[PDB]
């Protein structure tokens, strides 16, 4: 029925992102309290999406 | 004792060593001694030559 008609839509789509830069990229702690020995833990990165 | 401290665990922060039962028994023995003085009582079965 709509061979030569126009069609328009209002649509919902899932949010999506890509990492375009990594910022304040690494933060660190030698956690030692209440451990058998010194341990290295990487704290949260910040991403610019 | 641990049951009354449910959810609390005690360790040496420099190591992974929690205190063993030896300390608890030792503490409990002196605790039952202290209660034995707190009322003028004998609190464990014990023979007496009087």
Distance of residue B4 Cα from the nearest chain A Cα, in angstroms: 23
Q: What H or E segment, with its residue span, contains residue A23?
A: strand A21-23
How would DSSP label each residue in B4-50? TTTT-----TTSS----HHHHHHHHHHHHHHHHHHTT---S------
Q: Determination method here? A: cryo-EM
- Which residues of B fall within a CB distance of 8 Å from A35? 16
Mutate to test the interface with A, among B14, B17, B18 (most CBs of A within 10 A): B14
- Check CB contact under 8 Å for A36 and B16: yes
- Please give the resolution of this entry in Å, rounded to 1 decimal: 4.2
Shortest distance, CA A37 to any CA of chain B (angstroms): 7
CA distances A1 to A6, A7, B13, Å, are 11, 12, 78
Distance CA A43, CA A28 (A): 6
């Amino acid at each position: 029925k709509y061979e030569n008609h126009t069609v328009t839509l209002k649509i919902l789509m899932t949010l999506r992102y890509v990492v375009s830069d990594i910022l304040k990229e690494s933060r660190y702690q030698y956690t030692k309290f209440n451990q058998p020995k010194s341990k290295f833990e990487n704290l949260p990165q910040k991403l610019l999406l | 004792v641990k049951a009354y401290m449910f959810g609390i665990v005690v360790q040496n922060p420099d190591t992974g060593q929690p205190m063993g039962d030896e300390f608890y028994n030792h503490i409990l023995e002196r605790a039952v001694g202290k209660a034995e003085r707190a009322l003028d009582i004998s609190i464990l079965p014990d023979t007496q030559h009087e």
